[PDB]
């Protein structure tokens, strides 16, 4: 289609065809220890995890004291026109429901989602 | 982020969890020496790998007779007007054509990029 | 012979001039790549674009 003419649609189908894994869009990861979701060992993630916490869902059996924190690079994120919403559903939809992902808002400069 | 050695048998202290006070405990698997964790984090994995080699280059490189020298950029910490510059000469050579300098004055060893 | 392998005085000067100007341009390219002022092209490492344009020159 006109995708053969304009470079933008060519580049979007380019990114849509190329294979992309997770370690290409991550900056660093850290395994913390929050025995309570209100503990928030790292200093500043308390805001968004809390604004989730006043809407608390899925406290079915326990709360796992073990946490996994992932940091993302918006450079590698936007170049493929990705944002952590689709990642968030597919990292859940595709592996099971044994994991649970809460995330920031992209207006914040660094893109972190905790599991 | 570091490592912990046992105080009795000098081995590697593993992290463990106790269901009483919700605190990280470091335990041994030869004896059972115990203590609590001060930073309460275990694993970290840096994938960006953007470590600035200003923390890895040595000050005695200014004794090398096979490196170029300069009279333009002087040293800030001592005011010497002679430096010796080079490249990264390591991995992470995707866009690695920076130019680290080292002062050549004896007992200055000041290093700086630009 | 060797009379057929030699040139006049004017041509030698022209060759020297063009060689000098090329060796000049290469130096500007190098010294502007040492201040991180080069921008890689799509699908090209920084080393790749540097060497590509110096090979062009
Ligand atoms: Zn021990
Ligand atoms: Zn100095």
Curated annotation (Swiss-Prot), chain B:
The keyword Mitochondrion does not apply. GO terms for biological process: maintenance of transcriptional fidelity during transcription elongation by RNA polymerase II; transcription by RNA polymerase II; transcription initiation at RNA polymerase II promoter; transcription-coupled nucleotide-excision repair. A zinc finger (C4-type) spans 6-31. It comes from Sus scrofa (Pig). One of its GO terms (molecular function) is DNA-directed RNA polymerase activity. Its main location: nucleus. Belongs to the archaeal RpoM/eukaryotic RPA12/RPB9/RPC11 RNA polymerase family. Transmembrane segments: none annotated. One of its GO terms (cellular component) is RNA polymerase II, core complex. Pfam families: Zn_ribbon_RPB9 (PF02150), Zn_ribbon_TFIIS (PF01096). This is DNA-directed RNA polymerase II subunit RPB9. DNA-dependent RNA polymerase catalyzes the transcription of DNA into RNA using the four ribonucleoside triphosphates as substrates. Component of RNA polymerase II which synthesizes mRNA precursors and many functional non-coding RNAs. Pol II is the central component of the basal RNA polymerase II transcription machinery. It is composed of mobile elements that move relative to each other. RPB9 is part of the upper jaw surrounding the central large cleft and thought to grab the incoming DNA template. Zn(2+) 1 binds at residues 6, 9, 28, 31. Keywords: Acetylation, DNA-directed RNA polymerase, Metal-binding, Nucleus, Transcription, Zinc, Zinc-finger. Component of the RNA polymerase II (Pol II) complex consisting of 12 subunits. Zn(2+) 2 binds at residues 75, 78, 103, 108. PROSITE patterns: RNA_POL_M_15KD, ZF_TFIIS_1, ZF_TFIIS_2. It is found in: Nucleus, Nucleolus. SMART domains: RPOL9, ZnF_C2C2. A zinc finger (TFIIS-type) spans 71-113.
């Amino acid at each position: 289609g006109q995708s053969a003419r304009d470079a933008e649609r060519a580049k979007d189908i380019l990114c849509r065809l190329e294979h992309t894994t997770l370690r290409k869009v991550t900056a660093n990861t850290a395994i913390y220890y929050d025995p309570n979701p209100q503990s928030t060992v790292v200093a500043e993630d308390q805001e968004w995890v809390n604004v989730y916490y006043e809407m608390p869902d899925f406290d079915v059996a326990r709360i796992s004291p073990w946490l996994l924190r992932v940091e993302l690079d918006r450079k590698h994120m936007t170049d493929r026109k990705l944002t952590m919403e689709q990642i968030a559903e597919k990292i859940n939809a595709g592996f099971g429901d044994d994991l649970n992902c809460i995330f920031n808002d992209d207006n914040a400069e660094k893109l972190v989602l905790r599991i | 982020v570091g490592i912990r050695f046992c105080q009795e048998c000098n081995n590697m202290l593993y992290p463990k969890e106790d269901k009483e006070n919700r605190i990280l405990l470091y335990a041994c698997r030869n004896c059972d020496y115990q203590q609590e964790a001060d930073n309460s984090c275990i694993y970290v994995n840096k994938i960006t790998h953007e470590v600035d080699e200003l923390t890895q280059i040595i000050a005695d490189v200014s004794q090398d007779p096979t490196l170029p020298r300069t009279e333009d950029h002087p040293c800030q910490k001592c005011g010497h007007k002679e430096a010796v510059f080079f490249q990264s000469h390591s991995a992470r050579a995707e866009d690695a054509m920076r130019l680290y300098y080292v002062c050549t004055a004896p007992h200055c060893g000041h290093r700086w990029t630009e | 012979g060797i009379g057929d392998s030699i040139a006049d005085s004017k041509t030698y000067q022209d060759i020297q001039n063009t060689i000098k100007k090329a060796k000049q341009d290469v130096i500007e390219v190098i010294e502007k790549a040492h201040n991180n002022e080069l921008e890689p092209t799509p699908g090209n490492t920084l080393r790749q674009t540097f060497e590509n344009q110096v090979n062009r020159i």
